[PDB]
Amino acid sequence: APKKVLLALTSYNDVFYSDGMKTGVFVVEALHPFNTFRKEGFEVDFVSETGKFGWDEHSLAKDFLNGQDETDFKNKDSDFNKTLAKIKTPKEVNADDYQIFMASAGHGTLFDYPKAKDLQDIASEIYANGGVVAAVCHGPAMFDGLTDKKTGRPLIEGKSITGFTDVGETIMGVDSILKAKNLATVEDVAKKYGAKYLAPVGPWDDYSITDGRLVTGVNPASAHSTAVRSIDALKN
Amino acid sequence: APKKVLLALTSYNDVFYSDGMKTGVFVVEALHPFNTFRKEGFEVDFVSETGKFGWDEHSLAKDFLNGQDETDFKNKDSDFNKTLAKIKTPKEVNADDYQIFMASAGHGTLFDYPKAKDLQDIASEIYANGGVVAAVCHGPAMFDGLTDKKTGRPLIEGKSITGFTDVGETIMGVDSILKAKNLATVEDVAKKYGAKYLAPVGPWDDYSITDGRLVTGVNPASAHSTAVRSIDALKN
């Protein structure tokens, strides 16, 4: 029986940082989970609201993209790039095909995930079928409006999750940008929908939580752990 | 409400392992937190049910005790040993003198912490006064019967915590000992008192949780992080 994962990417790719650089998909938040899932025999399909995406430019720097990751990223024939080329649109997705819905991130997600009704519907179905819903970094932004079809209440209500920290936004100086663009942080989303937010000791720590079949991670350093937890949570 | 920490130690020190070795206080679970609190300007008082304790023999191994830790451990004039020498009994303790109650562990805690009514009352008072209650490894055994003065309900009810894993007991082959000795695991205690147990990816990982002013860690590798968390939590 083919084990499949639907890996969502932000469809937002535009100027964001004060240096004029664009945000979008944080490379390793898509690549590490991809590698982790593939390693365990899972098939992975990518998807975005528009079927298109762009890379967060800061995630392209050597500090965040190097070694084997950089090699796979540059190799047009890598399993990673070939699968990205087949990225789907929500309409082209058959929710019942997946056991795991994983929301990769980058700040771009703050723009499209909250309003991604179709992806939320898919995630909701996958969860309703007993599958796992995972999100890393700003990925939990998609929990804004994500309803549990069984209870009809927010999927994260009464759940414990983690995700990008408010303090991280402040340290990066993007806090003023989020406010100016009327964007809500992960902690804002958690508070709004009655979820219990549990923070990492430090904003850049590899930190993740598994609450039943709801798995969350804090940042790029947590992408691998988040993917690992999503696989383990299949027994929940 | 002075700047002091009450560091609880298990008073149990008897043969426990299959190799005939005894359990007791896991050295680094007392030392690492001790160092962290002292570094941040806190005064530390040690305490145990009987005012006496013994070291877990397996925690004396080089893999668990080495470097500076091993030096401070062997130096009779070390601030650590000098403070350990002044270890108190619950009756000699004044709960209003502490901001943080920290329960160090080692398997021995499974024998005395659940019944340590006097230590639980102290922990309850410290928490009621707005202080922090923390526990690492098997330390959460201290939560068995621990009541929240504000509501009369179990202090951990409705709270998210972590602690030593059931799988870790199995891997160590000590599960048969707990069964024979009618002991409850940390996960058993969380389940019994309505807490949500959040597990680490691996049983030996440095993993900890801060849920308001209730702080928990999984194992020896998590002792430092648990102490760090208890300090940062004083603002929650």
Task: State the number of CA atoms in the 13 A half-sphere of A217 facing the CB.
Answer: 29
Interface probe with A: pick from B159, B165, B196, most Cβ of A within 10 Å: B196
Q: Which of B198, B208, B225 sits opposite A160 (nearest CB)?
A: B198
Residues 6+ apart with CB under 8 A from B170: none
How far apart CA A36 and CA A41 sit, in angstroms, is 9
CB-based contact B133:B126 (threshold 8 Å): yes
Structure tokens at A90: 């929500």
Minimal-distance CA residue of chain B relative to A225: B201
Dihedrals phi, psi of A232, to nearest 5 degrees: -65, -35
Distances (CA, A) of B198 to A3, A145, A159, A226, B62: 25, 25, 11, 14, 30
Instruction: Identify the CA nearest to B149 among candidates B224, B186, B104, B95.
Output: B95
Dihedral of CA atoms B49, B50, B53, B58 in degrees, nearest 10, equals: -50
Helices within chain B (DSSP H only): 27-39, 67-74, 79-85, 109-112, 117-128, 166-171, 175-180, 186-192, 223-232
Q: Give, as one character, the DSSP assignment of residue B10.
A: -
Q: Residue B214's beta-bridge partner residues?
A: B133, B211
Handedness of CA A115, A188, A159, A139 (dihedral sign): positive
Dihedrals phi, psi of A185, to nearest 5 degrees: -80, 170
How far from each other are the two terminal CA atoms of chain A, in whole angstroms? 18
Q: What 3-state DSSP class applies to B182?
A: coil
For residue B100, what is the enclosing H or E element?
Answer: strand B100-103
Whether B137 is a known active-site residue: answer yes
Across the interface, do A198 and B160 touch by the CB < 8 Å criterion?
yes
Resolution in Å equals 1.9
For residue B209, what is the enclosing H or E element?
Answer: strand B208-211
Instruction: Identify the CA nearest to B98 among candidates B110, B90, B109.
Output: B90
Structure tokens at A87: 């990225």
Chain A interface residues (partner B, CB cutoff 8 A): 160, 196, 198-199, 201, 208-211, 225, 228-229, 232
For residue B216, what is the enclosing H or E element?
Answer: strand B214-217
Which of chain B's residues have a Cβ under 8 Å away from the Cβ of A201? 208, 225, 228-229, 232
Interface probe with A: pick from B205, B207, B209, B222, most Cβ of A within 10 Å: B209
Instruction: Identify the CA nearest to B167 among candidates B193, B186, B143, B189.
Output: B186
Q: Give, as one character, the DSSP assignment of residue B140.
A: G
Hey, what amino acid is at B96?
A: D
Across the interface, do A208 and B199 touch by the CB < 8 Å criterion?
no
* CA angle, residues B112, B115, B119, in degrees to nearest 5: 85
Whether A169 is a known active-site residue: answer yes
Q: What 3-state DSSP class applies to B135?
A: strand
Dihedrals phi, psi of A156, to nearest 5 degrees: -90, 0
Method: X-ray
Across the interface, do A229 and B196 touch by the CB < 8 Å criterion?
no
Q: What 3-state DSSP class applies to B133?
A: strand
Which of chain A's residues have a Cβ under 8 Å away from the Cβ of B229? 201
Q: For residue B28, count other CB atoms closer than 10 A to its CB.
A: 24
Across the interface, do B201 and A160 touch by the CB < 8 Å criterion?
no
In the block, tokens 């936004």 appear at: A169
Dihedrals phi, psi of B225, to nearest 5 degrees: -60, -35
Q: Where are the domains of chain B?
A: 1-236
DSSP string for residues in chain A: ---EEEEE-----SB-STTS-B--B-HHHHHHHHHHHHHTT-EEEEE-SSS---B-GGGGSTTTS-HHHHHHHH-TTSHHHHHHHT-B-GGG--GGG-SEEEE--STTHHHHGGG-HHHHHHHHHHHHTT-EEEEETTGGGGGTT-B-TTTSSBTTTT-EE--S-HHHHHHTT-HHHHHHTT---HHHHHHHTTPEE---SSTTS--EEEETTEEEE-SGGGHHHHHHHHHHGGG-
Q: Which of A160, A208, A228 sits opposite B160 (nearest CB)?
A: A160
Min distance B181 CA to chain A CA atoms (Å):
29
Active-site entry in B138, B157, B187, B224: B138
* CA angle, residues B71, B76, B82, in degrees to nearest 5: 110
Whether A58 is a known active-site residue: answer no
Min distance A210 CA to chain B CA atoms (Å):
6
Min distance A17 CA to chain B CA atoms (Å):
30
Q: Do strands A214-217 and B43-47 pair parallel, antiparallel, or not at all (unpaired)?
A: unpaired
Q: Residue B88's beta-bridge partner residues?
A: B47
CB-based contact A54:A13 (threshold 8 Å): yes
| CATH topology classification for B1-236 | Rossmann fold (3.40.50)
CB-based contact A13:A24 (threshold 8 Å): yes
Across the interface, do B160 and A196 touch by the CB < 8 Å criterion?
yes
C-alpha R_g of chain A = 16
